[PDB]
């Protein structure tokens, strides 16, 4: 299954864009893809944590996106 989500990089070279990706990917792969897209500098903060802005919740960098419930329309603010 495919979903469409919004990613925020306000901490690292503030920018905003949206991705379409297959559901079964893990969280860290999203971070890797984002880094590939923007070619941003510095490695990410250890642990690859992320925050779902429109739910007030936090997940570690080991979820499978289908598992902890990240469906269409949610905003992912990268810590």
């Amino acid at each position: 299954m495919y979903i469409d989500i919004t990613i925020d990089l306000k901490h690292y070279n503030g920018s905003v864009f949206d991705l379409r990706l297959s559901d079964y990917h893990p969280v860290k792969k999203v971070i890797d893809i984002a880094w590939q897209a923007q070619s941003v500098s510095m490695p990410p903060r250890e642990g690859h944590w992320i925050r779902v802005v429109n739910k007030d919740k936090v997940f570690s960098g080991e979820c499978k996106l289908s598992d902890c419930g990240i469906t269409n329309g949610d905003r992912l603010e990268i810590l």
Binding site: F17, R20, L21, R51, V52, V58, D74
Partner: protein
């Protein structure tokens, strides 16, 4: 669960989800089950099998439950701890409390964790503090891990953060409900409770309609009447009038009670049927069962609330009684006349207009109408499923940062081409409107036009200086083909700008006042007052409405861009 501890960080992993064919690995590559970037792993890659510990080609022994195994590499230390049990869940209510002290060293703490009761308990202490409606953390000894990183100084706590301490996880939620997950036992003194819930919140990712509840307006007739008749001498005169007074007082009380009941019923029904925008936000927050309650089969869809004012009553009052002209207006006459006016009209009730009767117009200074269109769009969106209603919107390029929040709603998604509903410039216009006009043409060219109801009902909103003044599609937007499931709204600063075929018109006078002045193609006038409004919560509302269910590439307003 398998924990991993290295310098100033702690990570977590679950092993039950894989067969033994996959060797658990710890290394630098993302492909590895656990990723570390600061440690080069120059000697080799750590791995497990069964547990058996192997550093590349080297063997270091085994691991057993409820005991720590340490190993060294690259002049740094790493731990490994394994557990297979599952934790408990509990909730506590803080209330008026101003501080919460947690410790395993002192028995006076509110939450006491005896060090002996667990194999890996460690001496520590910390406290939570509140100030100005916000929570904060303050370590005092031992160690604390926040979001997976150690901390050493007073820090404010944000809504979703998670604290880790002695294999215990603590979370906070505004309104001050404290949640804990633990593999342990601890004493406590706080009040225990549970969160409220329903069925819909439990089925949250899925949604399905429910039976509707409808009320009928109070239809009734009432009757009324008012008086018409105009020692020796002392007893003769007064007592008759006294009897008159008593009897008429009783009669008036009865009628007053009846009229009060009827008026209250009508007010209640009108308030129930048309809630304001803030109420829609609040209902959407809790996932009420009223979302998307209407449908094409119903009659009262495409009906909007504009404000509050004065409305006529729906129950007749037969004030005729006896003929008043017989004699002069007495005190009883005056009381009856005074009561006659009050219950004729209800006050502070919704004023409603309909859109299904043809094109609608708006007139007034630009800024106020611009600030107002939000109410109408939100109200229309709350009551209709995206299987039935789709929008199209036109506006000025400069105003984009104010109109952005609507792009995430579901109804704005086109049905036949993957593109958004907005329009900025000539390129997007020529991209979209041509296809829309072609699609509408087929609707026009068919015999079953009158019989069928085309499924997606397009609602056009136009607010821009006409960049569309010469396009073909204007042939249909002129408003004579309303059976094609199309509707329109327009805005301008003066009446002359609009067309002559309008069937409803509104006008805003100032910050708080307005009135209708055309309806059903006839001249009319009713004043009304605008509602209080807020515009900073829209993003959450739209995103929440996006989720309900009823290859890699980037996505933009006008197509898809494959990644690399």
């Amino acid at each position: 669960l398998l924990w991993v501890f290295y310098q100033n960080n702690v990570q977590k992993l679950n092993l039950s989800n894989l067969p033994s064919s996959h060797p658990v690995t710890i290394g630098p590559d993302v492909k590895d089950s656990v990723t570390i970037s600061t440690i080069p792993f120059n000697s080799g890659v750590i791995s497990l099998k069964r547990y058996e510990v192997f550093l590349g080609n080297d063997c270091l022994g085994t691991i057993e439950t409820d005991i720590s195994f340490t190993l060294q590499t690259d002049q740094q230390d790493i731990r490994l701890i394994l557990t297979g049990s599952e934790p408990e869940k509990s909730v506590y209510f803080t209330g008026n409390r101003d501080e919460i002290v947690c410790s395993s060293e002192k028995t006076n703490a509110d939450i006491y964790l005896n060090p002996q009761d667990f194999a890996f308990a460690e001496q520590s202490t910390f406290s939570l503090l509140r100030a100005g409606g916000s929570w904060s953390v303050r370590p005092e000894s031992g160690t604390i891990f926040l979001n997976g990183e150690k901390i050493n100084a007073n820090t404010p706590l944000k809504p979703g953060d998670e604290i880790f301490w002695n294999f215990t996880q603590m979370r906070v939620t505004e309104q001050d409900l404290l949640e804990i997950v633990h593999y342990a036992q601890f004493e406590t003194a706080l009040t225990e409770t549970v969160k409220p819930s329903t069925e819909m919140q439990k089925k949250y990712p899925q949604y399905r309609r429910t039976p509707r509840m409808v009320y009928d307006l109070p239809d009734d007739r009432v009757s009324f009447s008012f008086p018409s008749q105009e020692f020796r001498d002392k007893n003769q005169r007064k007592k008759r009038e006294e009897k008159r007074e008593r009897v008429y007082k009783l009669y008036l009380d009865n009628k007053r009670k009846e009229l009060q009941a009827l008026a209250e019923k009508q007010k209640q029904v009108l308030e129930f049927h048309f809630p304001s925008f803030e109420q829609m936000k609040y209902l959407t927050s809790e996932i009420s069962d009223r979302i998307w309650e209407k449908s094409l089969e119903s009659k009262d869809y495409l009906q909007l609330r504009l404000g509050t004012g004065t409305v006529p009553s729906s129950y007749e009052i037969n004030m005729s009684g006896g003929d008043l002209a017989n004699r002069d207006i007495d005190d009883l006459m005056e009381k009856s006349q005074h009561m006659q006016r009050v219950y004729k009209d209800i006050r502070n009730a919704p004023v409603t207009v309909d859109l299904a009767e043809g094109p609608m117009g708006l007139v007034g200074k630009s800024q106020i109408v611009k600030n107002e269109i939000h109410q109408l769009i939100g109200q229309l969106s709350f009551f209709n499923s995206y299987h039935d209603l789709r929008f199209v919107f036109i506006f000025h390029e400069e105003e984009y940062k104010d109109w952005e929040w609507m792009k995430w709603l579901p109804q704005f998604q086109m049905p036949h081409i993957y593109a958004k509903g907005f329009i900025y410039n000539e390129q997007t216009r020529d991209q979209l409107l041509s296809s829309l006009y072609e699609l509408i043409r087929e609707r026009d060219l068919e015999d079953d036009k009158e019989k069928l109801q085309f499924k997606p009902h397009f609602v056009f909103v136009i607010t821009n200086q006409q960049l569309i003044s010469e396009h073909v599609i204007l042939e249909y937007l002129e408003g004579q083909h309303e059976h094609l499931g199309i509707s329109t709204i327009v805005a301008a600063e003066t009446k002359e700008s609009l067309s002559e075929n309008i069937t409803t018109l509104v006008r805003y006078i100032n910050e708080h006042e307005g009135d209708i002045l055309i309806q059903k193609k006839k001249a009319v006038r009713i004043p009304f007052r605008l509602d209080h409004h807020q515009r900073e919560d829209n993003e959450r509302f739209s995103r929440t409405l996006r989720t309900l269910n009823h290859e890699i590439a980037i996505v933009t307003d006008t197509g898809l861009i494959p990644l690399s």
